[PDB]
Amino acid sequence: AISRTNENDPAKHGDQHEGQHYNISPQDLETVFPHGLPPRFVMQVKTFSEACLMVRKPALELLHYLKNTSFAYPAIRYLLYGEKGTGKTLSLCHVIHFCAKQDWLILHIPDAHLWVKNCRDLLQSSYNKQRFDQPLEASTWLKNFKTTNERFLNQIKVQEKYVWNKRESTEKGSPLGEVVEQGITRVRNATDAVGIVLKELKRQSSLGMFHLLVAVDGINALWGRTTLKREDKSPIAPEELALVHNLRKMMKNDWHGGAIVSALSQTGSLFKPRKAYLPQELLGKEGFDALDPFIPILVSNYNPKEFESCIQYYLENNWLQHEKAPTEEGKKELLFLSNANPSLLERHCAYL
Amino acid sequence: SLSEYAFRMSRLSARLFGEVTRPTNSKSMKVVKLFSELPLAKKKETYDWYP
Amino acid sequence: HYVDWRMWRDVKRRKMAYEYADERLRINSLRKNTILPKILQDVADEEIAALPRDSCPVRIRNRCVMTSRPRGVKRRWRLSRIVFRHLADHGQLSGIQRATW
Amino acid sequence: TEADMEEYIWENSSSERNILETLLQMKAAEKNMEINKEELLGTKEIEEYKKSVVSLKNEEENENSISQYKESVKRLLNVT
Amino acid sequence: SRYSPEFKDPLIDKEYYRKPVEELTEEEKYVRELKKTQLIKAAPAGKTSSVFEDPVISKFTNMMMIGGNKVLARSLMIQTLEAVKRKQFEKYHAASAEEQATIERNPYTIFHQALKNCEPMIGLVPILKGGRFYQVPVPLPDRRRRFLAMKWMITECRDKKHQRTLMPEKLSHKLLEAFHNQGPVIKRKHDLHKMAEANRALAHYRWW
Amino acid sequence: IDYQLYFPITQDREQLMFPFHFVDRLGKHDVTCTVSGGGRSAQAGAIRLAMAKALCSFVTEDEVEWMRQAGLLTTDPRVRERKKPGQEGARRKFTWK
Numbered sequence: 001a002i003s004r005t006n007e008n009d010p011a012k013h014g015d016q017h018e019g020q021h022y023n024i025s026p027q028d029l030e031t032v033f034p035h036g037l038p039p040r041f042v043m044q045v046k047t048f049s050e051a052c053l054m055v056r057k058p059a060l061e062l063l064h065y066l067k068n069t070s071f072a073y074p075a076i077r078y079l080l081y082g083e084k085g086t087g088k089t090l091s092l093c094h095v096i097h098f099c100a101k102q103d104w105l106i107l108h109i110p111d112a113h114l115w116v117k118n119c120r121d122l123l124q125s126s127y128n129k130q131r132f133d134q135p136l137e138a139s140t141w142l143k144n145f146k147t148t149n150e151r152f153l154n155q156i157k158v159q160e161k162y163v164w165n166k167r168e169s170t171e172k173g174s175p176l177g178e179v180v181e182q183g184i185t186r187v188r189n190a191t192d193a194v195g196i197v198l199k200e201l202k203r204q205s206s207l208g209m210f211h212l213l214v215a216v217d218g219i220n221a222l223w224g225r226t227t228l229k230r231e232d233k234s235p236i237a238p239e240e241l242a243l244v245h246n247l248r249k250m251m252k253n254d255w256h257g258g259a260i261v262s263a264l265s266q267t268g269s270l271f272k273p274r275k276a277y278l279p280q281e282l283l284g285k286e287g288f289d290a291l292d293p294f295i296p297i298l299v300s301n302y303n304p305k306e307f308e309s310c311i312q313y314y315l316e317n318n319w320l321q322h323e324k325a326p327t328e329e330g331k332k333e334l335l336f337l338s339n340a341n342p343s344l345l346e347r348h349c350a351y352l
Numbered sequence: 353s354l355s356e357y358a359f360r361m362s363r364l365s366a367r368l369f370g371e372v373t374r375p376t377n378s379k380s381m382k383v384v385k386l387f388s389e390l391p392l393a394k395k396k397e398t399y400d401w402y403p
Numbered sequence: 404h405y406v407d408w409r410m411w412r413d414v415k416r417r418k419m420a421y422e423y424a425d426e427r428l429r430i431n432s433l434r435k436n437t438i439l440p441k442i443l444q445d446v447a448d449e450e451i452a453a454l455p456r457d458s459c460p461v462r463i464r465n466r467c468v469m470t471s472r473p474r475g476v477k478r479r480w481r482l483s484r485i486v487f488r489h490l491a492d493h494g495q496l497s498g499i500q501r502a503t504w
Numbered sequence: 505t506e507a508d509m510e511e512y513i514w515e516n517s518s519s520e521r522n523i524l525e526t527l528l529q530m531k532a533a534e535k536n537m538e539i540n541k542e543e544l545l546g547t548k549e550i551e552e553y554k555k556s557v558v559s560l561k562n563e564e565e566n567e568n569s570i571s572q573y574k575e576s577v578k579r580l581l582n583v584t
Numbered sequence: 585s586r587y588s589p590e591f592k593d594p595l596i597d598k599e600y601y602r603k604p605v606e607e608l609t610e611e612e613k614y615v616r617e618l619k620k621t622q623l624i625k626a627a628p629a630g631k632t633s634s635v636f637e638d639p640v641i642s643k644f645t646n647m648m649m650i651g652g653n654k655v656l657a658r659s660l661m662i663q664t665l666e667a668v669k670r671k672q673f674e675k676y677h678a679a680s681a682e683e684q685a686t687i688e689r690n691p692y693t694i695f696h697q698a699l700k701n702c703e704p705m706i707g708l709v710p711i712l713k714g715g716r717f718y719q720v721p722v723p724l725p726d727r728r729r730r731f732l733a734m735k736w737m738i739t740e741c742r743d744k745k746h747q748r749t750l751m752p753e754k755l756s757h758k759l760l761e762a763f764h765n766q767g768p769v770i771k772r773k774h775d776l777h778k779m780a781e782a783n784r785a786l787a788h789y790r791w792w
Numbered sequence: 793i794d795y796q797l798y799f800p801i802t803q804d805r806e807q808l809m810f811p812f813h814f815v816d817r818l819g820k821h822d823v824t825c826t827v828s829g830g831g832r833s834a835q836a837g838a839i840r841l842a843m844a845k846a847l848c849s850f851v852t853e854d855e856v857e858w859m860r861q862a863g864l865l866t867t868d869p870r871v872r873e874r875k876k877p878g879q880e881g882a883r884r885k886f887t888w889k
């Protein structure tokens with residue numbers, strides 16, 4: 001097994017592990033990645049009965065910044081950009097697994113394009129009547145956020161009195177867990193509970209209690225357009241949504257004690273061309289201005305070394321059954337058809 | 353959905369190139385199209401159709 | 404000495420449409436707007452409807468100039484398909500040939 | 505307004521305000537009294553950071569201009 | 585046809601040309617020189633010289649396509665191959681140590697064998713004798729039975745009995761049932777075999 | 793634009809590979825083409841034929857004859873057929889009453 005690495009702890013990966021897959025344990029997979037992993041990578045975990053992720057330079061470069069990150073300075077925004085199917089989402093997961101092991105607080109937005117499209121029950125808010133709430137989409141996230149950070153939900157305590165209703169309110173000094181549970185049980189104050197969670201975590205982080213990781217995949221949704229419509233069939237702007245308005249506050253570098261890692265994505269985007277992958281094109285003027293200053297990190301296609309170890313992980317699990325696959329001439333066609341592209345290569349090998 | 357600078361600039365261009373200056377709707381712009389073209393009946397293909 | 408009375412009627416129609424072209428244009432201009440009062444537009448609706456019917460251009464018919472055929476007419480030559488082909492089949496229409504491709 | 509300008513100007517812009525506020529929180533973390541606008545802009549690092557934003561906004565955006573802009577932000581934020 | 589009779593069909597086989605001149609027989613050697621003089625048609629888009637090219641999986645894709653939408657017909661075929669592949673891996677991890685030796689995981693070997701288990705041997709052809717049509721048993725040719733196997737599988741899946749099931753899940757389920765000699769497509773072959781063996785008394789009406 | 797980006801459909805990429813795979817020299821040349829007109833599948837075929845013709849200068853005479861016998865150097869003459877005045881289509885006829 002030249003494609004696997006025995007070091008399954010992401011705090012010790014380096015340049016000598018590049019190209020080798022490391023093993024994410026089942027306990028960490030359910031806890032760390034309830035909703036993060038791509039939908040077509042969970043078929044591989046379910047079929048291979050193991051989640052093995054490659055160590056590449058994008059994540060190694062980004063792990064080297066989060067180790068030497070000063071927690072006194074304001075949070076630094078890191079942006080992963082690349083062509084379609086290049087692994088930026090999976091690279092982000094690599095960093096979420098590095099920070100979860102070090103008792104960070106993981107604020108993981110697995111796909112932010114889902115909040116700006118195909119919303120059936122778009123209730124008007126009660127805390128502010130100019131904003132709309134998304135109860136079905138905020139309560140699905142709280143259940144996963146609770147799973148990842150179950151331990152901290154009791155240590156962390158709120159510093160204000162949040163009134164859900166005249167009858168029911170949460171008093172200063174409770175556990176944050178109560179806020180989360182309120183939003184999961186009622187599925188109508190959830191959108192307001194999410195806003196409280198973001199506000200408390202951001203404020204407390206600066207104090208120094210816990211390190212915060214804001215992992216937002218598909219971050220070009222926040223400053224784009226929506227396909228949601230009002231009762232009068234008028235387009236809704238993204239800042240009218242209460243869930244999308246509170247998430248822009250976490251992206252601003254007005255707090256310290258944490259890092260902001262995000263990843264662009266044209267898959268699921270609105271009113272963007274297929275070949276658009278650069279930050280300005282996807283983010284736009286509004287997005288670039290808000291994020292600026294930010295550190296963009298490029299994710300590219302498999303290089304020759306990384307391409308061979310991807311095919312040795314598929315051949316070591318007997319996932320390439322066609323008798324010409326393992327030969328030297330069969331790999332030249334896979335390399336050509338995919339041009340060393342993880343998704344195109346992984347989509348062409350699924351039916352061999 | 354235009355800025356004051358852009359809107360006023362457009363008005364300025366409409367005065368130099370001899371366009372409409374006041375805000376007029378689409379129904380009232382046919383008057384510009386009725387007097388800017390020759391009517392069908394005065395065209396030479398109409399009244400000199402036959403030998 | 405026109406082909407038939409149907410042709411002769413159109414000739415008058417086209418002559419009366421040329422005399423009232425301007426008068427009708429000036430009166431419609433008032434009607435075709437949202438600026439002038441309805442009171443004035445209602446008076447112009449009665450003035451343009453009192454003019455002879457033959458001044459209306461929608462009564463003009465593009466017939467053939469040789470056989471006065473109302474349908475099957477080509478506007479560029481003002482001829483019917485039957486008269487056009489006759490001259491085209493004898494090589495009398497410059498540039499006109501049969502198409503094969 | 506800015507929407508009417510057909511050419512991006514760094515002066516009095518969001519980029520100049522964002523990087524200027526970011527550099528003031530960095531001084532407070534280091535407990536320093538060097539809080540002068542003119543001095544910060546004078547630095548060469550700022551000159552390279554404003555030349556990259558004015559090239560991304562005006563000129564064609566390519567992978568070479570996103571890497572030149574990245575190096576200018578790693579010196580201001582001390583991200584060696 | 586825009587091609588003349590002179591034009592001959594091309595040979596995409598890549599291992600044929602490589603054959604050494606020493607192996608070339610006198611008849612074969614002659615052919616190779618003759619082809620030089622002949623004009624050759626342009627290879628169509630459907631078939632390439634890849635190592636994964638399967639003529640049976642390309643013909644089955646063309647028999648499902650509707651209105652020239654080959655991107656969707658090919659998409660359904662690959663999803664079906666991946667569904668057969670994923671369903672056998674799920675039946676292989678949950679099987680006993682000695683049951684894993686008899687579990688096929690190659691979707692192609694399943695596709696070709698399932699279609700071979702549906703090929704009928706004899707068919708019924710209506711023959712006019714004495715002013716009446718008799719469904720007399722006639723031996724189907726090799727191509728006919730290969731075509732009927734594909735047509736029946738696509739008709740069964742298209743049949744509107746499954747209310748809301750996607751073709752990849754339907755075609756994959758029928759291919760795994762025919763692999764084990766089960767299902768309606770196999771039953772449809774038996775019903776044609778039971779009617780050709782009951783009406784064998786009229787096996788002399790035919791002449792050819 | 794990189795070919796995989798320009799040609800998303802695999803079939804189109806397969807056509808591009810065909811010439812090089814046949815002469816067993818994949819990953820040995822750099823191609824820069826510019827196709828104009830037609831549609832998705834018409835552009836690949838036009839590039840295949842151009843690459844194949846330009847790849848005959850870097851192969852032996854015997855290999856060029858094999859390419860010819862494989863249909864890689866012939867221009868497909870199949871083009872759309874015209875519609876006739878009295879029919880629904882090029883060859884389809886209106887329903888006979």
Ligand SMILES: Nc1nc2c(ncn2[C@@H]2O[C@H](COP(=O)(O)OP(=O)(O)NP(=O)(O)O)[C@@H](O)[C@H]2O)c(=O)[nH]1
Nearest residue numbers: 127161162163164189191192193195196199242246
């Ligand atoms: N239901 C409820 N939600 C609250 C309450 N206090 C805060 N929130 C949630 O927390 C979010 C942030 O609150 P706050 O800091 O006051 O920000 P804001 O009211 O939105 N003002 P702005 O949008 O201008 O920054 C609010 O949008 C709402 O979602 C409360 O008492 N009840």
Ligand SMILES: Nc1ncnc2c1ncn2[C@@H]1O[C@H](COP(=O)(O)OP(=O)(O)OP(=O)(O)O)[C@@H](O)[C@H]1O
Nearest residue numbers: 038041053054085086087088089090267342343346
């Ligand atoms: N580091 C890696 N280890 C293992 N597989 C990978 C890795 N990177 C990419 N892949 C393969 O590529 C596929 C797609 O990767 P990913 O979902 O990260 O693409 P993406 O960059 O997010 O694309 P999009 O822009 O469409 O979201 C994965 O399902 C996986 O099979």
Ligand SMILES: [Mg+2]
Nearest residue numbers: 088089090265
């Ligand atoms: Mg992604």
Ligand SMILES: [Mg+2]
Nearest residue numbers: 379434435436
């Ligand atoms: Mg009217």
Ligand SMILES: [Mg+2]
Nearest residue numbers: 880881882884
């Ligand atoms: Mg047709």
